[PDB]
Amino acid sequence: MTDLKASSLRALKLMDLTTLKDDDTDEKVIALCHQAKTPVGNTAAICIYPRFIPIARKTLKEQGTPEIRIATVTNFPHGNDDIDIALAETRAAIAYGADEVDVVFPYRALMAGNEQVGFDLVKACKEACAAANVLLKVIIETGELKDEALIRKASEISIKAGADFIKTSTGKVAVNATPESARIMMEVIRDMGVEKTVGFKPAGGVRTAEDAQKYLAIADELFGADWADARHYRFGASSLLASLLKALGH
Amino acid sequence: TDLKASSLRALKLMDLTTLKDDDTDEKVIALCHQAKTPVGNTAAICIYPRFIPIARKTLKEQGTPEIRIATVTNFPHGNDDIDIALAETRAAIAYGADEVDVVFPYRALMAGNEQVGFDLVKACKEACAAANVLLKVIIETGELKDEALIRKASEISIKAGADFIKTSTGKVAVNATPESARIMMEVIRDMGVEKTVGFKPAGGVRTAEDAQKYLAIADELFGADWADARHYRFGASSLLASLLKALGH
Ligand SMILES: [Mg+2]
Ligand SMILES: [Mg+2]
Ligand SMILES: [Mg+2]
Ligand SMILES: [Mg+2]
Ligand SMILES: [Mg+2]
Ligand SMILES: [Mg+2]
Ligand SMILES: [Mg+2]
Ligand SMILES: [Mg+2]
Ligand SMILES: [Mg+2]
Structure with a gap:
């Protein structure tokens, strides 16, 4: 029994x-649904394109894991900054x-100076999600924002507009989660005092058990070791699962 | 008979x-830019749902919001899972x-179940009608194959409220044929629903000469003025280049 095994199951x-x-x-x-039902327990969720949601729901139900989100x-x-398109996709x-x-x-x-559209777009999408008891995460794309001031500002605007999570990255640009970006975003959660209502999700490039342990360590430091539960912390990842299972002897 | 006249119609x-x-x-x-052709606009585009918002914006910004x-x-x-079909429709x-x-x-239906097709089409029609959305039903004539099954699937779809019956997905080995098209249009005529139910051949329709054959069937069964945008569509892609070529473009 090691800290790495404990962190790997947690992750x-x-x-x-x-x-x-x-x-x-x-x-x-x-x-992917079958993989989410691992021999050591279920992942918190799967993340897929919207058109696959109905078959995923059926698959999760039929394997006895309807609790996987x-x-x-x-x-x-x-x-993009077209709220009508973002809202139509969210609906x-x-x-x-x-x-x-x-x-x-x-x-x-936001980088071009528009703080308002980010607030309005997140708020519109949160309104739709909240009306359906759906949780809203907001991807701020830290690898494109780059500057700490912009990462903090995007995080702050997203939280003010009602984000239930802030997420580093899409995984579809070159630069995704870094420990530095993760720390900045979690510091915003702490500084605004919203740790009970806003979670954090690093995404993209988190591939090994040691990586996951490093990101969890930041949460344990800033919020206490009990904070990072499924409502407050998620890993957006794929190949990470095999690394975690290997660390656990599976 | 003139291929230029039928091609502009198609x-x-x-x-x-x-x-x-x-x-x-x-x-x-x-594709949206292509639909605004030098001889007029197509009736519609047909795309996967996730592209609807960007297509709507593109069609509006080029001044063709009338392209459906x-x-x-x-x-x-x-598949026969009505919950899944209805969720995707919503x-x-x-x-x-x-x-x-x-x-x-x-x-x-090929396994003997007529009811699931009725209930699935009806559920999707109810959602569409409430949203002022038209429902076409793809019966997949190339998998049904038998004339009796093509007629039955058409009949069930019409009774469950289809606004159009459509031959094919374009994703199986056999899609539209003139034979299948005639069978489906005969059902529309025989049930007396030519005012409320259109027809759409789809898949494999690639040439102006083929388009001419499908319109000729409609003209024979219903008269030459029946096939307008509410009652007839071509489901096709590369056909547009063949039609434009027949028209000198
Ligand atoms: Mg297992
Ligand atoms: Mg793709
Ligand atoms: Mg599908
Ligand atoms: Mg709130
Ligand atoms: Mg793109
Ligand atoms: Mg610092
Ligand atoms: Mg897209
Ligand atoms: Mg079934
Ligand atoms: Mg398939």
Whole structure:
């Protein structure tokens, strides 16, 4: 028994087990659902494109794991600033049956000086999600924002507009989660005092058990070792699962 | 008989389609531009639901908001899970579809189950009608094969409220044929629903000469003025280039 084994099981149970690939199929999503039911316990969720939600729901139900949440993505991956498009996609994700929607913040608009559109877009999408008892995560795309001031500002605006989680990255740009970006976002959660109502999700590039342990260590430091539960912490990852299971002897 | 006259008619009745594994926003934007042809606009585009919002914006910004947006649900499998089909249909409506082409559960019908097809079409029609969205039903004539089954699937779809019956998904070995088209249009005529139910051949219709044959069937069964945009569509992609070529473009 090691800290690495303990952190690896913890991380596994916080995973949004993800496939968001150009060649995704029903068959691949079904296999992903089976993978989410691991020999050491269930992941917290899967994360898939909206069109796969109904077959995923059926698959999770039929294998006896209806408690595995179905997350999806909207305004994705580009984070455009057209609220009508973001909201139409979010309403469709809800209609497909999403439990959680991860919407991309309009980060290029923010970089260009538009703080208002990011607030309005997140608020509109939160309104739809809240009306359906769906949790809203907001992807701010730290690898494109780059500057600590912009990462803090995007996080702050998303929280003020009602984000239930803030998420680092889409996984569809070159640069995704870093420990530095993660720490900045979690410091915003702490500084605003919203740790009871806002979770954190690093996504993209988290591939090994040692990586997961490093990201969890930041949460334990800033909030206490009990804070990072499924309502407050998720890993957006895929190949990470095999690394965690290997660390656990499976 | 004139191929230029039939080609201009067919162009204006096209649901210009892309339903491909490599579809992207860029490809759908290009399709929207293609639908605004130098001899007039197609009736609609037909795309996967996730591209509806960007297509609507693209069509509006080029001044052709009258080009309708059709999409597909329960597609292409035609499975018999009504909850899944209805969820996808409701999502298509929420994306902004003008029209939903749902796949009939034809494998269930081939196994002897007529009721699931009725209930599935009816459930999707109820959602669409409440949203002022038109429902087409794909019966997959190339998998049904037998004339009696093609007639039965058409009849069930019409009785459950289809606004259009459509031959095919474009995703199986056999799609539209003139024989299947005639059988389906005969059902429309025989049930007396030619005022409320249109017909759409889809899949494999690639040449102006083929388009001419399908319109000739409609003209024979219903008269030459029946096939307008509310009662006739072509489900096709590369057909548009063949029609434009026949028209000198
Ligand atoms: Mg793709
Ligand atoms: Mg398939
Ligand atoms: Mg197992
Ligand atoms: Mg997209
Ligand atoms: Mg709140
Ligand atoms: Mg610092
Ligand atoms: Mg793109
Ligand atoms: Mg599908
Ligand atoms: Mg079934």
